[model samples]
Target: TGHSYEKYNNWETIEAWTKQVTSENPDLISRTAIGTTFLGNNIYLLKVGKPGPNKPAIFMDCGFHAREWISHAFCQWFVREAVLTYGYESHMTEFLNKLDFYVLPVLNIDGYIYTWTKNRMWRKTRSTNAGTTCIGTDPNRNFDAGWCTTGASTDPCDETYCGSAAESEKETKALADFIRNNLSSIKAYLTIHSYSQMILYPYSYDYKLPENNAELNNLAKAAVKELATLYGTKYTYGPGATTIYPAAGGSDDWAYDQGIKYSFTFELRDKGRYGFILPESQIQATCEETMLAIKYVTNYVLGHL
Candidate 1:
């Protein structure tokens, strides 16, 4: 029922680990199938919190890009921490009691498996389209935020290909559908990605600020400050385009447009020497620091609600 945050675990292992933990701790955690992937894998969600009606929830997913192994690691690490620390830590207990967390460890399940077997640098969904030799779509760019306008490519072979249409990829569609269905209950949408060491908010589709721009920016700044305190890891905070690139069709912007004002994205770990192949030795430290930032944001969401 326990996983070592000190090493990388394959999809099968993490999927089984999640089921085991949920079965062992039904009162604290529950597992559900959100949707099925094109490659026949079930996209599972670990719901961590006490049972309740319409609880304010945070929807978080990692492994959007198949190569970002550390991003997925943080997802698993957060779930483990939430389950393990519920009764041991008062704040954690209180947070879980008040807010629900839907944790999707691997959003792009098919692509992640491909990274281990066929390619180590794959970064898209493993679905094929007609009349094209290309094999996958960039799920990050396949969302409905801007739909292939800017910071995304029209060519299916490109890394930032936005798919045939908005939410065309099944993975993107599934997550978006789930969020839309539960919009009344979900208050925050947090997606984890890697190698940039930045905390970003809405407006990735354009340069204009969101309605709650100041609050989003302030919360990101505070969360980044909390993140830095653990290992002195520095992180810049701002809009996605301003902080990093103007990646249209990003999950954060899509979620924000859907009225999830607390939407944010974390580009975890190193600034890029190790890149996607971050060492296993750094997993514990990286997850430990990132956990603080997550808790800070979730706690803020709960208070605001």
Candidate 2:
């Protein structure tokens, strides 16, 4: 309950924390910054679980949109679980022996920094120029699947502005390249977002089902059931378009297109009462409950793997 959540200190701090994690845990946790963000912040990723080219693994990313701080908290908490055992309160030993886990705590570094020091509601990457004073682009809408087709605005001022081209953002390209490089062993993709209490699957561009939709939906439902049973948290599970609003170019959609059949976007915690202002009080409970759900999903995938 005394889990103190700190904001990202700086590039040095991020790098330092990464080094500490790797040193403390040895081969269990390693740092890999995919690339630099628009603002030159290193987009760091922690490779948890087994170290090999043949192990089937899951990729989990957080901080897609800047204002959603809770998502990052869930991610960091998950990483903590992966590194060490706190009493009888850890799941890494159970998971790492089987499958690998890649956890990216902060995906939108520039925008996340903006939320900490500048604008608390900034929801995009901070990439600006002289002509366009308005900074940042929606990282969620900057994916490759159905790039800027529908439910996304063309105006740069809008919140859901898909970039000028597919994988236009530097982070997007970096993530895409990493996924391409690791697609063979990565069977599941999990992207974390906030304030919706929903577990959404692929096909957000259209309200349709993917080839493995049935199997994916079953896993989502099972995750929700497990989470609910842990703490009586009510979570809805369905396609992204129908469950939540239709959003073009989500990570799950792009990952599924790339053949990650168990792709999912987990929108964590409260349904908008606190919104992005969720306090530290809910951090542990939220993380604990969500861990149950994630472990269930992982267990299901392990059987097939």
Candidate 3:
């Protein structure tokens, strides 16, 4: 009966829905406030899976860029399916029983709300650093990996502005700190963005290959194959700099530097037909196909552990 997948939901609705889902799925879901955003909105993380002791986990976050509404939608869709299908779907149930998923529904809450209200294209934190007229910084470009280097702007007014320093945005700091503290348990890091239909791995800041480059490519190939089975959606997979453009200070690269071997970044759906304004009608198919790829990658991480 969960037909809420057909429309784009507002931030308030997302907040309430997360609480409601956590409350209803007591056995497999738990929620916590990691920290507050620049606008003081709670950064809620849902730990979804069966209760366990020290199980390997995968970290997945969406809505890093404010205008990428479909990214946030997919995160909500993933949690809903995981909790609702656990007992009914054998593979899902077994997957949850064997591993845990740390899901962050939206990384840029202030920017997300801003996109709905003030601008439909905002893509940065709403914090105002001193000495600059610009009001925000790109959280994706605010990480420590090759920060403020090529592909990242240092000007506060730029869309891809790297923050004053690494982990400068509170949202980025909170999530980065959490991952660092729980480094031993998180085997894979997955950050979802949109409009390219690509699955990328580390070294976006440069052209060098990762140590486990071949393994990552194999896993991405297998996962993309599984993703295509649902809707024949094609996805290009490879190093970030080669498959897509080089993007510095990305969380996927930082996570890889921190030793998460299976780190990946997904640019989901449409290949720019709708751009950031993708319609509500396509949410289900977009999410359904993306889910297969995520599960394939997560299962691979679980086995290799």
Candidate 4:
């Protein structure tokens, strides 16, 4: 019942929560290390849904940027909700019964850990190539979709830097590989980000809309409406260029490329009033309300697919 951004959970605490979910909800939650991060943090994925042969899956990831503490917190809460729903009957029961929800709670584990240790604003991996002392590439901009094109900065120091090449970071690569390999059942990809309350669909590199823009826009609008009903927190749903800042090479775009019909990037909470400084007091509310929006999308996709 308590969801606030002030909740402080270290890496160990989050890992413990995940382990417990997998152990307690053995029938529903299957935890595995899909890949390893640049700093050797195990890239874990928790598969949550009913017992079935082949269910359509939904992909959700968070913490691609280091300073976005609220993103990771929302992810943790999402995992908790999954475990709770599996053990008990909630509004998400029907969705979970028919769909597999795959969550990568922490996308940039190395950068996240670095933020905990050195800088609170670190935004990339902790990898160092040939001569670039500036370690870490913007994972969002390192995707192979319209990479280094428009809407992304080229300066390595910029927050929107598109990295040296697409799939540059091991974390992004791991994500790309997962979506590519699981293109069949994964019908939708939802990546959670923070400080900007916006729901964005694909084709961020340019102003043009995706071929499925109408369908994507409708789904996003539906989710936003559900989210608003939860807490009156209004969210604008549109292309990244129009809703929030245009960010190229992002996970949503890559997932769209992999044929995910409902690819979305959710920038949660604060409306940029405080940006990345969202306090622990707001974490629970954000997560609780966000869970509603996510469940709506999952249920809609489950029925449509």
Query: By lDDT, who's the top model here?
Result: 3
- Per-residue alpha-carbon lDDT of candidate 1 for residues 110-224, written as tens digits (9 for 90 to 100): 9999998999899999999778999888998988887788999988888888898998888999999999998988899999999889999988888889999999889999999
Candidate 3, residues 27-98: lDDT per residue as tens digits?
999999999998899999999899989888899999899999899999999998998889998878888998
Clashing pairs in 3: none
Error of 2 at 52 (Å): 4.3
- Residue 129, candidate 1: alpha-carbon lDDT: 77
> Which residue pairs show backbone clashes in model 1?
none
Cα-based lDDT at residue 186, candidate 3: 94
Report residue 188 deviation for candidate 1 (angstroms): 0.5
* Candidate 2 accuracy as TM-score: 0.93
Specify the poorest-scoring 10-residue window by lDDT in model 1. Answer: 1-10
lDDT of each: 0.89, 0.81, 0.91, 0.81
lDDT of 3: 0.91
lDDT of 2 by residue, 51-143 (tens): 665777899998888888888778877877766662343455657867788888788888888887888888988876335666667888888
